[PDB]
Structure formats: C-alpha cells, structure tokens
C-alpha cells in the first residue's frame, strides 16, 4: 500500500470486525530542569509521544521532538504489521463475536 498508515489500519481492522482502535498523541517532556525562574518551564525539551492504541494495547509507538518524525516511527510500526501479517495489530477480537483457531 502507499502512505497513510491510519487508513490501512482502519481498512482491515474495521473489516475484521473491529472499531476499537486509534492513535494517541501525548507530550512526554524531558525534564532536565531541576529548578526554574518562572511558574513552569515555558518551553522545555518536550517530545511528541505518538502511539497507536488497539484494545488498550500499544501497536505502534514513536516519540520524537518533531511531530513528523514521531508520526513516522509509529506509522512504520503497524505498516510492518500489515505487510508482515503480524497478529499484533491484526488479531481477531470480540467487537463482533468469538474466534476460531
Ligand atoms: Zn476489536
């Protein structure tokens, strides 16, 4: 496929009978500051903790100072999973019914 990992994730997962998934974007600031001279560190060295959630689990993780790089990492995570067919993102679940081995 090409490009947008989110669409790929949706394309198959929603078709597997899943709707419970999505990306989370929380900032993980690296506090190298012991004390400071203002209320809070106006702007310290923070990192965008991009991650992909699937049933409360972490399928993709990519923390970077650059939003693009952060996204890039997590994207290539699930990207490899749908390419390699690793069940970490693509496993069957009960958003519809039971499963069969
Ligand atoms: Zn599900």
UniProtKB/Swiss-Prot annotation:
Describe the effect of residue 93 to S. Abolishes retention in the nucleus and function in RNAi-dependent heterochromatin assembly
Q: What happens upon changing residue 8 to A? A: Abolishes binding to dsRNA and dsDNA. No effect on retention in the nucleus, nor on function in RNAi-dependent heterochromatin assembly
Q: Where is this region: C-terminal dsRNA-binding fold?
A: 6-98
Which residues constitute the signal peptide according to the record? none
**Residues that coordinate or bind Zn(2+):** 18, 55, 93, 95
The organism's superkingdom is given as Eukaryota
Annotated compartments:
Cytoplasm; Nucleus
Q: What does this protein do?
A: Required for G1 arrest and mating in response to nitrogen starvation. Ago1 regulation of cytokinesis and cell cycle checkpoints occurs downstream of dcr1. Required, indirectly, for regulated hyperphosphorylation of cdc2. Has a role in the RNA interference (RNAi) pathway which is important for heterochromatin formation, accurate chromosome segregation, centromere cohesion and telomere function during mitosis and meiosis. Digests double-stranded RNA (dsRNA) producing 21 to 23 bp dsRNAs, so-called interfering RNAs (siRNA). Required for both post-transcriptional and transcriptional gene silencing. Required for silencing at the centromeres and for initiation of transcriptionally silent heterochromatin at the mating type locus. Promotes histone H3 'Lys-10' methylation necessary for centromere function.
UniProt domain comment: The C-terminal dsRNA-binding fold contains a bound zinc ion and is important for normal nuclear retention and function in RNAi-dependent heterochromatin assembly. It binds double-stranded DNA and RNA (in vitro).
Q: Which family does it belong to?
A: Belongs to the helicase family. Dicer subfamily.
In Swiss-Prot or TrEMBL terms, this protein is called Protein Dicer
Q: Which organism is it from?
A: Schizosaccharomyces pombe (strain 972 / ATCC 24843)
Q: Which gene encodes it?
A: dcr1
State the covered range within the intact protein. Answer: 1259 to 1358 of 1374
